[PDB]
Amino acid sequence: PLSAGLFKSEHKNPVPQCPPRLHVQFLSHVLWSRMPNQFLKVDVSRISERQGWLVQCLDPLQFMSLHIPEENRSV
Amino acid sequence: QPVQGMFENFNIDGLFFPVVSFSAGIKVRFLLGGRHGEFKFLPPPGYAACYEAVLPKEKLKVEHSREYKQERTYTRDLLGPTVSLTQAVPVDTSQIVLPPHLERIRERLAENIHELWVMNKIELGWQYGPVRDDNKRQHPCLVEFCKLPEQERNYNLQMSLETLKTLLALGCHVGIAYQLTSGYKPAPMDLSFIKLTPSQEAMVDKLAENAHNVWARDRIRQRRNPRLVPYTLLDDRTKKSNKDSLREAVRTLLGYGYRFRIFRAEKTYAVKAGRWYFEFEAVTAGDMRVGWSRPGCQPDLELGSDDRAFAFDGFKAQRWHQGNEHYGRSWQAGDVVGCMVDMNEHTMMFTLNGEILLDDSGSELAFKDFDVGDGFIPVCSLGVAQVGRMNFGKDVSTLKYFTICGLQEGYEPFAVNTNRDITMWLSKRLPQFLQVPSNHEHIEVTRIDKVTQKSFGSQNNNTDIMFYRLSMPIECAXXXXXXXXXXXXXXXXXXXXXXXXXXXXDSDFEVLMKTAHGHLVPDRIDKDKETPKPEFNNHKDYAQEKPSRLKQXXXXXXXXXXXXX
Numbered sequence A: 001p002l003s004a005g006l007f008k009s010e011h012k013n014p015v016p017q018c019p020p021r022l023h024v025q026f027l028s029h030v031l032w033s034r035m036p037n038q039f040l041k042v043d044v045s046r047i048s049e050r051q052g053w054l055v056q057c058l059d060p061l062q063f064m065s066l067h068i069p070e071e072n073r074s075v
Numbered sequence B: 001q002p003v004q005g006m007f008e009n010f011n012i013d014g015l016f017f018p019v020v021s022f023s024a025g026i027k028v029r030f031l032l033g034g035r036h037g038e039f040k041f042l043p044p045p046g047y048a049a050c051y052e053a054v055l056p057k058e059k060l061k062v063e064h065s066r067e068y069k070q071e072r073t074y075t076r077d078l079l080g081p082t083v084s085l086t087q088a089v090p091v092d093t094s095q096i097v098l099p100p101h102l103e104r105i106r107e108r109l110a111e112n113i114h115e116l117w118v119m120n121k122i123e124l125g126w127q128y129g130p131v132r133d134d135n136k137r138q139h140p141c142l143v144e145f146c147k148l149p150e151q152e153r154n155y156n157l158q159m160s161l162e163t164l165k166t167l168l169a170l171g172c173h174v175g176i177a178y179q180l181t182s183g184y185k186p187a188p189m190d191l192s193f194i195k196l197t198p199s200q201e202a203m204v205d206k207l208a209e210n211a212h213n214v215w216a217r218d219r220i221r222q223r224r225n226p227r228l229v230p231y232t233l234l235d236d237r238t239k240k241s242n243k244d245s246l247r248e249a250v251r252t253l254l255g256y257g258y259r260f261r262i263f264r265a266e267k268t269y270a271v272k273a274g275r276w277y278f279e280f281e282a283v284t285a286g287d288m289r290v291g292w293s294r295p296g297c298q299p300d301l302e303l304g305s306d307d308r309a310f311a312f313d314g315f316k317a318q319r320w321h322q323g324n325e326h327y328g329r330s331w332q333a334g335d336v337v338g339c340m341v342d343m344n345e346h347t348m349m350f351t352l353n354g355e356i357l358l359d360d361s362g363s364e365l366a367f368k369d370f371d372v373g374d375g376f377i378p379v380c381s382l383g384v385a386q387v388g389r390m391n392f393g394k395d396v397s398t399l400k401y402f403t404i405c406g407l408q409e410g411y412e413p414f415a416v417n418t419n420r421d422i423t424m425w426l427s428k429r430l431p432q433f434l435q436v437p438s439n440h441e442h443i444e445v446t447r448i449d450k451v452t453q454k455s456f457g458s459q460n461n462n463t464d465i466m467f468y469r470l471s472m473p474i475e476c477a478x479x480x481x482x483x484x485x486x487x488x489x490x491x492x493x494x495x496x497x498x499x500x501x502x503x504x505x506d507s508d509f510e511v512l513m514k515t516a517h518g519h520l521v522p523d524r525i526d527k528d529k530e531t532p533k534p535e536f537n538n539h540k541d542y543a544q545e546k547p548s549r550l551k552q553x554x555x556x557x558x559x560x561x562x563x564x565x
Helices: B100-122 B150-169 B198-219 B236-256
Strands: A025-027 A053-057 B026-030 B261-264 B275-282 B288-293 B309-313 B318-321 B323-326 B335-342 B347-352 B377-382 B387-391 B433-435 B465-469 B503-511 B519-524 B528-533 B542-546
Touching: B100 B150, B100 B236, B150 B198, B150 B236, B198 B236, B288 B335, B288 B347, B309 B377, B377 B387
Parallel strands: none
Antiparallel strands: A025 B433, A025 B465, A053 B026, B261 B377, B275 B335, B275 B387, B288 B309, B288 B377, B309 B318, B318 B323, B335 B347, B465 B503, B503 B542, B519 B528
């Protein structure tokens, strides 16, 4: 029945209130990314054969990703 | 056998390309034609291949689509933004009238082109005959202008008029200032004696460019030909040939006499005491700055603009702070520069290939009497098409100019006593959504509270478009999802209704006037209702609900869509 009454815990409140989480966010550019200290280390063919363009990577690599659900974003 | 799915109605704009994405434990093999790969099946009727899509006279190699995804040592070629590289029309000629005072000169130059195109054939020795063909070595255009009809005269004069039109439209006005044959002597004057000025050389060059451009625009209708490729990408040999063939005309004419990216160390490696030194190698010589920034610097502003960064540039040979002052000399392609900071004495120095930089005042150190603040982090900024390499120490065998200067003075590397390499925090390109800060200009948002509103407020002199968005989105899974935009008068607007389980976040893309009081209000009539209440000058602001979309530009169309089947 309301905007705020659909993405919160309760829904049977027909009163239009604004919780402190609802704050405007602008598409900004002041941000930093982190470069991993260990990449996938993939070699492609190193022979460049005539039977196709090869790529091969057997060494695995995993990392832990935090997930903000209210923003639906992984970091 | 094919699949039952295609992504129709998608954004046709952009440079598409084949791409594979693999996690680990993978052995993939793409298959092109020719020497690149080996086709095992047949292509669809008419569909070409990537081995033909490759540019002529260019080696095709595979590379990481994202970035320099090379698990290597510190000798990684860190690069900033890139130019378009021209990865994706003739000049206007007939837009000017034909003056009559040079119409005879145009006749004589057209007949000059005619006699040149016939002597081109008498080089091979063609014969005069009534039939037209090439392999038979004969040409019916061996008669002179008195007997030849005007339609073929018009066809031969077409090329002459176009080439003279481009010559006159090139920016400079052009006014007034034996052999055994069957009876024809092609010999207007001497050609090898005279010499063509470089101005006319470049003029006829652009003339031939335009000629080949219009020829290609005519040939694209007649598939995937090197001649169909534009003249700027044509083969140099045919370029030279066409160039001299079309420059013989001007020889005859003159004969008779008519987004930067900022990289840095991790802010937790801030230093407040000691002598620290780090190297920066620059392969190119474009826009590059290097230095030490406090742990509050902006990744979007130029390095060294505000007090939050102590930088130095080689593109202008000056140190970068609040203001500018000439310092040191510039570098070349493939140089190195070592930056030193003594925090106990508060001195900053730069050595270009061992030579300590010097200003006009005669002080070896760049900056003096700067507070330690929160520390200093090694930082560089690379503009468009730049290639650099940082070295925070940890490799003295590769620290070339460190043993020459700094080691005897008492300067130690940045990461000499370090076991794991630095994180190398870079400036990201994706413009994520951030909360409006209090200490910001031209973006001020209040909060009032009957109904609750979140009004806006601004003050500046430069206008632009902002992309405001709410914090929490609305999801629907898995029921009916329909987004309807209804105006105050009626619901006569664009209505989108296609979402299986998406989290549509409310947003408004607004333009900034001098006074912008447009805001968002959560109201209620029968269901969830958000009213983006605007104010005066409401003609280019949009308000809708959007999933994750992060693109900074200025458009309302081509918003990257798709429809699966």
